[PDB]
Amino acid sequence: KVKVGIIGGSGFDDPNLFKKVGVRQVTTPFGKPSDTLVEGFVGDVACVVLPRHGKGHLIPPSEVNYRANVWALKDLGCTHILATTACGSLQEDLVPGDFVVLNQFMDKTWGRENTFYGSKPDSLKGVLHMPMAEPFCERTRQILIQAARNKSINVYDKKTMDKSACIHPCVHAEGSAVTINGPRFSTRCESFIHKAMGLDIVNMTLVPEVSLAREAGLSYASIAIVTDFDCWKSEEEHVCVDMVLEQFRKSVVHVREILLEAVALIGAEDWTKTIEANKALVMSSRQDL
Amino acid sequence: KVKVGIIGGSGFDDPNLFKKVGVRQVTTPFGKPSDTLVEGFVGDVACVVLPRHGKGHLIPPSEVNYRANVWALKDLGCTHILATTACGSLQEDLVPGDFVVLNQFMDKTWGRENTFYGSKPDSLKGVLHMPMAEPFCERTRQILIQAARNKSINVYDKKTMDKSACIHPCVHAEGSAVTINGPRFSTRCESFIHKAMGLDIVNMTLVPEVSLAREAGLSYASIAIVTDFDCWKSEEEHVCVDMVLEQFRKSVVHVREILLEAVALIGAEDWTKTIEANKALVMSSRQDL
Amino acid sequence: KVKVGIIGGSGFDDPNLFKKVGVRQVTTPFGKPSDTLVEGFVGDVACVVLPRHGKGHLIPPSEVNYRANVWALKDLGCTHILATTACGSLQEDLVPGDFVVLNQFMDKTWGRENTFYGSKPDSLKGVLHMPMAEPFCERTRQILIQAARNKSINVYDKKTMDKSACIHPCVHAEGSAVTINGPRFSTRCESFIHKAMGLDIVNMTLVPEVSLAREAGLSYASIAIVTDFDCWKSEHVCVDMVLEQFRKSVVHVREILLEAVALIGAEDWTKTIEANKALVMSSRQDL
């Protein structure tokens, strides 16, 4: 009944989550996806993994074909999409090695194809105005957090827990990302303003991925990996990048376990009313109709 | 002498403002307008109307040819442009069913052709840097406000009236819009930040329409219709939607009355000096000259 | 060992900084630069100048080919780029006639080609994520500031000096620019928000020029001229006073630039140039 797609970011350019059956090349009305897809199973649940940047990480965030990636997963029968993203921290209690199950974002991207619908021949005919106040699938968000608990990963909820209960590495139960266009990182001025706005992390790939998943009627949740992009500040930059990469490798191992546990938890529940509600929200958001 | 163009937004896809005298299928140096232009009279005042999204509302906000629409109206001899827009509220005193005669905006659009001038073969030769501190025609703004008073619609002016005088439904005598690119609505995170910046309403179509009107030497004023896009929060979304659409239908009836009265009020005054000043501001903003 | 490129903004459409020894009518793998590049010398220091908007100021900010301008200077062997920009003030102590040696910015541009690298067939292959926390070359920033001191122009550093040391016209030793896409100026609503964010000046041309210079392994520094774009509040006499002051500001910036080229050539830059190139290599994520 359910099928989980996985969009792997940095650290997942060469997917190896499960015992691979075969790789699959697909075409899409909006172009080719970033790479071939790896098809397999976790339990009795079909799973398919797609590297966001391609196998060698040769595609930058602004040039990723998010429409083709999301539609390819849709056409393969996916009902859910779990995604990863490496990010920088903007707040004290989010430190390298932590994870964030995001629930909000502020969009600073531009020049990317961010909708399936329009009046151009390269899009589906129609005008679609999708509500995005809470842009993720809340059921799928809580499954990622429960998967972390099941794998004995600390979970921190700043609305219900003291800052001393912040035990790293932890999964932050909530968080907002500012998605910048890249490829450059932010200036200190820009980072200060983003921090003053209360944003938790900065990344480059969440939007329009999260928006297109909802346009496709798919349940989408993202888990962000906090890393460190400031090794240029240390005196021994070569040692710093080695230490940050080693911690990032350990973070990828944790996220791999969370993703595998989440796929099983998704396949254990019924999603009939949620999938139907995902499809109806698309229909009701059609202004031309 | 004076000739009033009207750009009808949502709810005005079939404007139906006056008896059609001429129907003009127009071509501009910047492409085709959203639809055929309908020419006629309101009283003794010549008037031209076009629907921003075309018949059937097939054109989303980001793909409207704002240059062709404004240029076509200018080409037919318009001296003024009155425009409508359906918007969502960001502040407590702006309630669905109110109207706003906008006087300010913050631009968050991208990827739209926003100027007639440039160095490319498809633009007018020159470099134009237009002042936009107060981006509307103030005379024409006050015409819309007087038109509302003449049609016995409450007018609330926060500059001179207390919040106790805010009697709904009312026309707000001033207001600022954040224009997002669409087609999606804002996240809660984005709406919270726009509200913290003091913006009154959110829409998707004001920019670059207001900018191009001033580039063309035209007097531009907008009247926003506050409606409700958050029907998903409701227990029975089917019931709220019908209530919101019924309120929106009443709103377009009153906006039609305001537009027709505003056209008559424009025609009752001399605009020689204002038109002359509109044209002179374009010439004085040419940096290449 | 050094060669200084100069990108002249408004007021420098016909630069004329030195005797023209030669001209270079060139194009790049990313298109045509804004105009012919003019080669010469300041003392014994090689210099190249190009007008950002081309002669006659026919190219608006959003259509300037920043990639081609930076690449053409790099192609001629430039090690540094000094750039000028005319800007408006967002804060009370930045008054028309002042200058700013920028050290920060907030980017509100869009639709401009802003990187040499990517997966497109016509770009340099690879994924380049350059750090930009402090986006200018700091050594070159201090050269511009020292050049102003050497030309008898007041310098104001709000980190160490009370506001009583802000004697106009002055070079502000640091400052942030919000770069808007243009061509229109900001609404009062937008200006109020930019001011509340603490930004010092507003312009239209700094980004992506500063980003691409770092991608190219070049030392880049910008000197802004504060002028006044709000004479519509008055009329033609207001404009004439603002234009005369801007003319004087252009003369001052000309003296600053010529002294800066001499100060750059008087020092060794082997280490800094090698660091510029090593930062490009270490920012390649595909490697």
Tab-separated table of N, CA and C in Angstrom, chain B residues 78-144:
chain	number	residue	atom	x	y	z
B	78	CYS	N	-4.310	55.294	-22.727
B	78	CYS	CA	-4.634	55.422	-21.314
B	78	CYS	C	-3.681	56.396	-20.632
B	79	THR	N	-4.237	57.200	-19.727
B	79	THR	CA	-3.461	58.065	-18.852
B	79	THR	C	-3.386	57.546	-17.427
B	80	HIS	N	-4.330	56.694	-17.026
B	80	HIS	CA	-4.402	56.124	-15.690
B	80	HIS	C	-4.588	54.619	-15.794
B	81	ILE	N	-4.195	53.917	-14.733
B	81	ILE	CA	-4.500	52.501	-14.565
B	81	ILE	C	-5.032	52.290	-13.154
B	82	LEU	N	-6.241	51.745	-13.052
B	82	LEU	CA	-6.781	51.230	-11.802
B	82	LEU	C	-6.700	49.710	-11.839
B	83	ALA	N	-6.221	49.106	-10.752
B	83	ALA	CA	-6.046	47.662	-10.695
B	83	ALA	C	-6.594	47.111	-9.387
B	84	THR	N	-7.078	45.873	-9.443
B	84	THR	CA	-7.545	45.153	-8.268
B	84	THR	C	-6.609	43.991	-7.966
B	85	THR	N	-6.657	43.523	-6.720
B	85	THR	CA	-5.884	42.350	-6.333
B	85	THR	C	-6.526	41.708	-5.111
B	86	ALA	N	-6.598	40.378	-5.121
B	86	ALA	CA	-7.087	39.614	-3.982
B	86	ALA	C	-5.907	39.224	-3.103
B	87	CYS	N	-6.038	39.447	-1.797
B	87	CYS	CA	-4.900	39.343	-0.898
B	87	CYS	C	-5.311	38.683	0.411
B	88	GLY	N	-4.303	38.252	1.165
B	88	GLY	CA	-4.492	37.734	2.506
B	88	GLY	C	-3.991	38.739	3.527
B	89	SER	N	-4.572	38.694	4.718
B	89	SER	CA	-4.235	39.640	5.768
B	89	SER	C	-3.046	39.154	6.586
B	90	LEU	N	-2.245	40.113	7.052
B	90	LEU	CA	-1.147	39.843	7.972
B	90	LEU	C	-1.289	40.582	9.293
B	91	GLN	N	-2.345	41.373	9.474
B	91	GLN	CA	-2.508	42.163	10.684
B	91	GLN	C	-3.945	42.050	11.177
B	92	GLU	N	-4.119	42.315	12.474
B	92	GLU	CA	-5.394	42.052	13.138
B	92	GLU	C	-6.522	42.905	12.565
B	93	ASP	N	-6.257	44.185	12.305
B	93	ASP	CA	-7.299	45.107	11.870
B	93	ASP	C	-7.669	44.960	10.398
B	94	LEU	N	-6.978	44.109	9.646
B	94	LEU	CA	-7.327	43.836	8.257
B	94	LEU	C	-8.078	42.510	8.220
B	95	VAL	N	-9.387	42.587	8.004
B	95	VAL	CA	-10.290	41.452	8.166
B	95	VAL	C	-10.853	41.077	6.799
B	96	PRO	N	-11.021	39.787	6.499
B	96	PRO	CA	-11.655	39.395	5.232
B	96	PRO	C	-12.955	40.152	4.994
B	97	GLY	N	-13.070	40.738	3.806
B	97	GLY	CA	-14.160	41.624	3.468
B	97	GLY	C	-13.768	43.085	3.433
B	98	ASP	N	-12.640	43.443	4.041
B	98	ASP	CA	-12.115	44.792	3.933
B	98	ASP	C	-11.466	44.998	2.566
B	99	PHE	N	-11.226	46.263	2.241
B	99	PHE	CA	-10.435	46.650	1.088
B	99	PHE	C	-9.281	47.524	1.560
B	100	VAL	N	-8.223	47.586	0.756
B	100	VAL	CA	-7.056	48.404	1.070
B	100	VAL	C	-6.649	49.181	-0.174
B	101	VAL	N	-6.583	50.504	-0.050
B	101	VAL	CA	-5.994	51.357	-1.076
B	101	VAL	C	-4.507	51.445	-0.741
B	102	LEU	N	-3.708	50.602	-1.390
B	102	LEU	CA	-2.307	50.443	-1.020
B	102	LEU	C	-1.515	51.721	-1.280
B	103	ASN	N	-0.491	51.944	-0.452
B	103	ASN	CA	0.457	53.024	-0.686
B	103	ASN	C	1.912	52.598	-0.575
B	104	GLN	N	2.196	51.355	-0.188
B	104	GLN	CA	3.568	50.892	-0.025
B	104	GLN	C	3.645	49.416	-0.385
B	105	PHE	N	4.863	48.945	-0.655
B	105	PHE	CA	5.039	47.514	-0.868
B	105	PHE	C	6.473	47.102	-0.569
B	106	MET	N	6.636	45.803	-0.323
B	106	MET	CA	7.934	45.143	-0.271
B	106	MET	C	7.945	44.041	-1.319
B	107	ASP	N	8.963	44.047	-2.173
B	107	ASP	CA	9.012	43.185	-3.346
B	107	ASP	C	9.805	41.920	-3.030
B	108	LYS	N	9.138	40.768	-3.108
B	108	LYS	CA	9.794	39.472	-2.998
B	108	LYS	C	9.564	38.630	-4.250
B	109	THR	N	9.344	39.280	-5.390
B	109	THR	CA	9.220	38.574	-6.656
B	109	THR	C	10.581	38.439	-7.332
B	110	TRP	N	10.657	37.495	-8.264
B	110	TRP	CA	11.870	37.259	-9.036
B	110	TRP	C	11.473	36.630	-10.362
B	111	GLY	N	12.378	36.724	-11.334
B	111	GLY	CA	12.181	36.051	-12.602
B	111	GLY	C	11.142	36.663	-13.512
B	112	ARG	N	10.617	37.833	-13.169
B	112	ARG	CA	9.636	38.529	-13.985
B	112	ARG	C	10.306	39.698	-14.694
B	113	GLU	N	9.929	39.921	-15.951
B	113	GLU	CA	10.403	41.099	-16.667
B	113	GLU	C	9.813	42.347	-16.020
B	114	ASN	N	10.668	43.186	-15.431
B	114	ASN	CA	10.195	44.283	-14.593
B	114	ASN	C	10.556	45.667	-15.123
B	115	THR	N	11.114	45.771	-16.329
B	115	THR	CA	11.435	47.077	-16.890
B	115	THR	C	11.315	47.033	-18.408
B	116	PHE	N	10.936	48.179	-18.987
B	116	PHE	CA	10.886	48.334	-20.436
B	116	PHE	C	12.253	48.622	-21.046
B	117	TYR	N	13.221	49.067	-20.245
B	117	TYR	CA	14.482	49.595	-20.748
B	117	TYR	C	15.632	48.645	-20.450
B	118	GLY	N	16.633	48.666	-21.322
B	118	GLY	CA	17.800	47.832	-21.122
B	118	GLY	C	18.715	47.876	-22.329
B	119	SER	N	19.654	46.935	-22.344
B	119	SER	CA	20.655	46.843	-23.394
B	119	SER	C	20.427	45.663	-24.328
B	120	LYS	N	19.352	44.909	-24.140
B	120	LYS	CA	19.067	43.754	-24.975
B	120	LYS	C	18.159	44.142	-26.137
B	121	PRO	N	18.143	43.344	-27.210
B	121	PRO	CA	17.394	43.749	-28.414
B	121	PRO	C	15.894	43.852	-28.213
B	122	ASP	N	15.342	43.261	-27.157
B	122	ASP	CA	13.902	43.243	-26.946
B	122	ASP	C	13.419	44.357	-26.026
B	123	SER	N	14.290	45.286	-25.648
B	123	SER	CA	13.926	46.362	-24.740
B	123	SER	C	14.140	47.713	-25.411
B	124	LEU	N	13.553	48.742	-24.810
B	124	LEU	CA	13.818	50.108	-25.233
B	124	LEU	C	15.243	50.494	-24.860
B	125	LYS	N	15.901	51.237	-25.743
B	125	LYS	CA	17.275	51.645	-25.491
B	125	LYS	C	17.334	52.664	-24.359
B	126	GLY	N	18.230	52.431	-23.408
B	126	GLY	CA	18.436	53.333	-22.293
B	126	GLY	C	18.487	52.597	-20.969
B	127	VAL	N	18.859	53.351	-19.939
B	127	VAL	CA	18.925	52.860	-18.567
B	127	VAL	C	18.046	53.758	-17.711
B	128	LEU	N	16.993	53.184	-17.129
B	128	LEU	CA	15.972	53.940	-16.409
B	128	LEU	C	15.983	53.532	-14.943
B	129	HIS	N	16.229	54.496	-14.057
B	129	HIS	CA	16.257	54.276	-12.609
B	129	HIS	C	15.156	55.130	-11.979
B	130	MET	N	13.956	54.563	-11.870
B	130	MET	CA	12.785	55.330	-11.440
B	130	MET	C	12.737	55.443	-9.919
B	131	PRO	N	12.507	56.636	-9.372
B	131	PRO	CA	12.186	56.736	-7.943
B	131	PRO	C	10.898	55.987	-7.633
B	132	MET	N	10.867	55.346	-6.462
B	132	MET	CA	9.711	54.544	-6.076
B	132	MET	C	9.387	54.668	-4.589
B	133	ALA	N	9.907	55.697	-3.912
B	133	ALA	CA	9.726	55.824	-2.466
B	133	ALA	C	8.250	55.781	-2.083
B	134	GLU	N	7.424	56.560	-2.776
B	134	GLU	CA	5.974	56.434	-2.690
B	134	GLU	C	5.501	55.980	-4.063
B	135	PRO	N	5.294	54.677	-4.276
B	135	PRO	CA	5.263	54.133	-5.639
B	135	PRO	C	3.946	54.293	-6.383
B	136	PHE	N	2.895	54.807	-5.756
B	136	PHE	CA	1.613	54.997	-6.422
B	136	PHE	C	1.402	56.470	-6.765
B	137	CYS	N	0.403	56.726	-7.610
B	137	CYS	CA	-0.046	58.089	-7.865
B	137	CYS	C	-0.970	58.515	-6.731
B	138	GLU	N	-0.543	59.518	-5.955
B	138	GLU	CA	-1.281	59.886	-4.750
B	138	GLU	C	-2.644	60.481	-5.082
B	139	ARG	N	-2.727	61.301	-6.136
B	139	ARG	CA	-4.025	61.814	-6.571
B	139	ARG	C	-4.989	60.673	-6.868
B	140	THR	N	-4.524	59.665	-7.613
B	140	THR	CA	-5.401	58.562	-7.985
B	140	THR	C	-5.736	57.680	-6.785
B	141	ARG	N	-4.804	57.528	-5.837
B	141	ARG	CA	-5.128	56.857	-4.577
B	141	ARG	C	-6.309	57.529	-3.887
B	142	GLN	N	-6.261	58.858	-3.765
B	142	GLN	CA	-7.328	59.569	-3.069
B	142	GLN	C	-8.637	59.506	-3.839
B	143	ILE	N	-8.572	59.351	-5.165
B	143	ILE	CA	-9.789	59.160	-5.953
B	143	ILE	C	-10.494	57.878	-5.530
B	144	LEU	N	-9.737	56.781	-5.406
B	144	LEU	CA	-10.327	55.516	-4.976
B	144	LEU	C	-10.949	55.640	-3.590
